[PDB]
A paper describes a structure:
Membrane glutamate transporters pump substrates against their concentration gradients, serving critical biological functions across all kingdoms of life. Transporters utilize energy from downhill ionic electrochemical gradients to carry concentrative substrate uptake. Transport domains translocate ligands across membranes by moving ∼15 Å from the outward-facing state (OFS) to the inward-facing state (IFS), in an elevator motion.
We generated a mutant, P-GltPh, that eliminates Na+ binding to Na1 (D405N) and introduces a protonatable residue at the tip of HP1 (S279E), mimicking amino acid sequence features of proton-coupled orthologues. Serendipitously, we found that P-GltPh mutant has two slowly exchanging outward-facing conformational substates, OFS1 and 2, binding aspartate with different affinities and enthalpies. smFRET and cryo-EM showed that P-GltPh is predominantly outward facing. To visualize OFS1, we imaged P-GltPh in equilibrium conditions, purified in the presence of 250 mM NaNO3 and 1 mM L-Asp. We refined the maps to 2.2 Å after imposing C3 symmetry. The D405N mutation abolishes Na+ binding at Na1 (Boudker et al., 2007; Riederer et al., 2021 Preprint); in its place, we observed an excess density, suggesting that a water molecule replaces the ion. The S279E side chain points into the extracellular milieu, away from the transport domain. Interestingly, we observed several water densities within the transport domain of the equilibrated structure contributing to the hydrogen bond network between substrate- and ion-coordinating residues. All six resolved buried water molecules are below the substrate-binding site. We speculate that the extensive hydrogen bond network in the cytoplasmic half of the transport domain ensures its rigidity. In contrast, the extracellular half, less constrained by polar interactions, can sample multiple conformations with altered packing.
Numbering used by the authors:
A (entry chain C), B (entry chain A), C (entry chain B): 2 to 416
The structure:
Amino acid sequence: GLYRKYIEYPVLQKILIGLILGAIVGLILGHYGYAHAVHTYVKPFGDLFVRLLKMLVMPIVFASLVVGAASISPARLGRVGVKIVVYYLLTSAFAVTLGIIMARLFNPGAGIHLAVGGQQFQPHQAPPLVHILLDIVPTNPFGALANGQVLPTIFFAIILGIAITYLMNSENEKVRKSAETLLDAINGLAEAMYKIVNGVMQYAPIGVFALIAYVMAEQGVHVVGELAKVTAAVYVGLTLQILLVYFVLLKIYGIDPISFIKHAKDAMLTAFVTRSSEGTLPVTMRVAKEMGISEGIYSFTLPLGATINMDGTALYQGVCTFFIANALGSHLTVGQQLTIVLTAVLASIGTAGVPGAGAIMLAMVLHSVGLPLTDPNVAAAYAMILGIDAILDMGRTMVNVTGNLTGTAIVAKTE
Amino acid sequence: GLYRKYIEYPVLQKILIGLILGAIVGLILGHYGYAHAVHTYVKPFGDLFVRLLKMLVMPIVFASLVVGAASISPARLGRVGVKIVVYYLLTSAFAVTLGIIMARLFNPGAGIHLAVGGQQFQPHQAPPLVHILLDIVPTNPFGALANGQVLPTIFFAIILGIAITYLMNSENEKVRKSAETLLDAINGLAEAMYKIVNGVMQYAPIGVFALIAYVMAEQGVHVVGELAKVTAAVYVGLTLQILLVYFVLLKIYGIDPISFIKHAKDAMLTAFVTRSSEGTLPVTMRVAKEMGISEGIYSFTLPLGATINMDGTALYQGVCTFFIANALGSHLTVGQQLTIVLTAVLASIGTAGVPGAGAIMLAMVLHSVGLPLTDPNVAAAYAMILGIDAILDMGRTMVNVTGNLTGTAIVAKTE
Amino acid sequence: GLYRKYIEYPVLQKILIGLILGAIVGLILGHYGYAHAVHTYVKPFGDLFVRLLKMLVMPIVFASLVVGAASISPARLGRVGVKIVVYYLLTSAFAVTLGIIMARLFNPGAGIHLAVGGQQFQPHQAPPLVHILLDIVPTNPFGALANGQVLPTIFFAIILGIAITYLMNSENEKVRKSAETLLDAINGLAEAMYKIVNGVMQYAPIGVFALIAYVMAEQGVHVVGELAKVTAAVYVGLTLQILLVYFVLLKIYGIDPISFIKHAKDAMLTAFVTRSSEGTLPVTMRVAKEMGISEGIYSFTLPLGATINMDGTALYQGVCTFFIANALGSHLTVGQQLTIVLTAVLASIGTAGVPGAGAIMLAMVLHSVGLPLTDPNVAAAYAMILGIDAILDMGRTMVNVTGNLTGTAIVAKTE
Ligand SMILES: N[C@@H](CC(=O)O)C(=O)O
Ligand SMILES: N[C@@H](CC(=O)O)C(=O)O
Ligand SMILES: N[C@@H](CC(=O)O)C(=O)O
Ligand code: NA
Ligand code: NA
Ligand code: NA
Ligand code: NA
Ligand code: NA
Ligand code: NA
């Protein structure tokens, strides 16, 4: 039947067909002013795909991390954490530098007609760092699970797994049996979640088509002029990030880039369409599992990187800061560029793994170089950037997920 | 001792004694203007009974559905879903038609003195259907469990059970063992919940007495005149719904109606007193379990029907729409009656399984026939209806639960 | 290394060093007006310790209580509950009487210069008792777990454990196996939580230092004059409560007070610094486990007492009521003193196990003797008391936890 024929077709080809055709359809409909129709009837399928992916985030993350922490010694986990944090920081700094270079090679926003009088934006307020750090520890793990909050779930899961391992080495028979039973149940939950991810990827092509079509119909028509040059700068910078950092590092550490891409294509495409690292996390974790990476490594690195490691976001923040600076006519000094590097790395760390968060966090980077959002001209340039936010978000989320996978693979190789 | 004597007495007789005596006491106290006293000291016992029943809804539903979906093939589950949805729609349409017939045989609200100047009601706003459908898929299953949300729990539980079955057929020993352990733990939780339901049914008589007494003391004195004819129409229609639909269908499909009633009496009485299908769900599921129905069928059908299958609600909506129409003096044409049938079926589907929801959803049916709640006269008639809402809600919730059980039994017989 | 040397050092000595040095440092810094600096950089470590302790409350309570109720017959549980409630009420009444005696021996607030014009306080409103009692039964156990709510969790856990035991005695093999698996998994979770408590107690010294330093720097400088006499009355009364009630009862029932103190020192110190019985509950439960007390007793008594049994709170409420009365110049009659005893016992029962709750609940006791917070003078005295609230809260929380442990030990001995 038709359903059997659809299911039997390879998932990669279906996803690619959906992506290309959704792009074409969305562009055509947007030019012809049917973006409202696309939002009304096409978007819900993509929303369903996104919801299905998000449904699996907390269970898979919690269960897989508990099992992995149970299967890995604490010292090794600490070494892995140190290595992955170093990799995260270095890659984010390199991404911001590459974005600045791309902005300087081109000149997005130079000699741009700026129109004042649009919507205003409230100045970015620095949240207290101490509160952010303390929030890593949950006051109620059940509440953290019920309210999302991936990072506190990670903390509690690691602690629980270490405790379970310590119990499984005890002298009491009953304690050992109870710990074994709990661990087996949690592992069963994790495997069930991975199977469900397999199932959802079959519906993935329809959601991919819908999401890309909506994004095109809503924003692609706005990719013209200075905004087109911004988009080109960002996307060339993302491509260079991939080729110069991830490919080179995989070559250095002995990982075949071609096999890596073959394994990671599904996660990359899901990140591209959903624009959510957190939402794409189940697919990324399945990719790591298929790569043969130990659970104790990826179950910890990928959920953490989905929040704190965003190379594409950092590159985009740098490029957009330079664009807004040129639009205002101001020139950024070398010290200001280094301030941009530091602040964009920090903002990328603080950016949530959800659509549109990087554009919001760009305000902190802009403020760091004396470009407050309260200024009417800065507000106008920021509004211009926000118009094509989803277009850039697709690529930058894709690069974020790709970098997370590259780091996980490298760290696994080193262990 | 007294406690032992109370516990040893049959539960059915205790519940019936409580029901009759609470009805008498509440009526007498209401006539004598002691409804405040009943609300203050008698109602809390019924509130406790309701809370105890609601405590078991989410765990029993989730665990039983996971186990049942694990024990049933997906194809069979789909066939069962199709059959049960067909039965739901047909029975709801028949219920609305029967309500219209009862309204036309009598004439509730004909020549009624209508007084304007009471409370006004905001016009019913149609919620977006796409959002309602999307909400079936939870973005966080833990959040869905923690916030009620039976339908998303059903979705996630079915998916999890199917995945667990697929794991239990794998070639890996460890995966099979982990899936077995998880399934066994969930099944233990479900059986514990059923035992707790058994325990709560022992306290049920006191709560039944309290609830019926409060309802009588608060609203029975208002059942006079045109409202008495409305109540008679609704209750005769509900009785006819039972006898003409459920009894006849059980006879057709070979199920003995007498044995069915003997098994289902506890759920029917609990629904009558609590006026909550969702709250009565644990008792209904226990009834189905005692009937010998397979878990894979009832664990799916009953939680779904508790939301989307409400024959009594549909019949009540039709009768009340006709009552409000006569009160306004307007005459409903045949096409308007068919509009009423369709819209009342839709409203019954959308009505929540909680007390008083059907009266709220009646606004959509009224609007469908050009009787907006903004009109002062429509508002007056609606307020008159709301005065005896609980009296009608008892019977209509009872019929809703009875129809859910009848459909589950028929579908089980056909499989 | 330094970390190994720190970890190897005995936990008791580390905690004591931290306590003493934090007290000294906080006092010195507060005199020198650096309380802001202590709040900014020192307090976060104590906040981290408190958060880590609170992270374990719900899982440990739920799992341990389920296991204990499964391991104990319902009749024995009822007998234990009756005994512990009797002990709670008697000890709280004695504590209030002792506080009144201490207030009368000294004269806190006598001849005190009262300044009007400060912040006003809204009159205490008596919450409905029926709603409070009904809230003991949760409408959703998952929601109760996710939102804290220790008491509903206790109720559901006891019910679940009893049901599990009844299942483990069934004739069905599958039901018995499923119940066994569920119980084993829950027990594994409980043991893991206890191990995590062991781990957190290693960091406890730093948090103790930080918390005591902040409390001193913020409020100790205010302990002068009439407030110093209030503090002396409260602390002498707490010491007398310990020695006259807990020590004497332990001697009577054959429990060695010295061994009891050696086992309970960690919980006592944690309660002293955190000022939260609920937050200290994991440490208290670990203390009871190390004492050899059966899980079926302590897993029920300690979580319940952490809410409803607060001797230190009752004593503090009595002392502060007398202080406010003298400050106003009013004289309390014997009947008013007995009203104080009853109302302070009730307020201590209703006081939450969190910092500063007893001061809030003191309003009910004050109102019971015609000292409404709306009066400007009563408001001034209340504000004066609130200035040193944390100083008194430390000791009163310590005494609350000590009394809970004493009652658990006595009840265990009697069984
Ligand atoms: N949407 C991106 C973050 C961003 O907005 O830049 C992500 O989820 O990774
Ligand atoms: N209370 C009914 C719905 C209604 O209000 O009609 C039920 O729970 O089934
Ligand atoms: N903080 C105390 C209660 C109080 O405020 O008196 C406790 O947790 O026990
Ligand atoms: Na990075
Ligand atoms: Na981030
Ligand atoms: Na129906
Ligand atoms: Na409904
Ligand atoms: Na007490
Ligand atoms: Na209390």
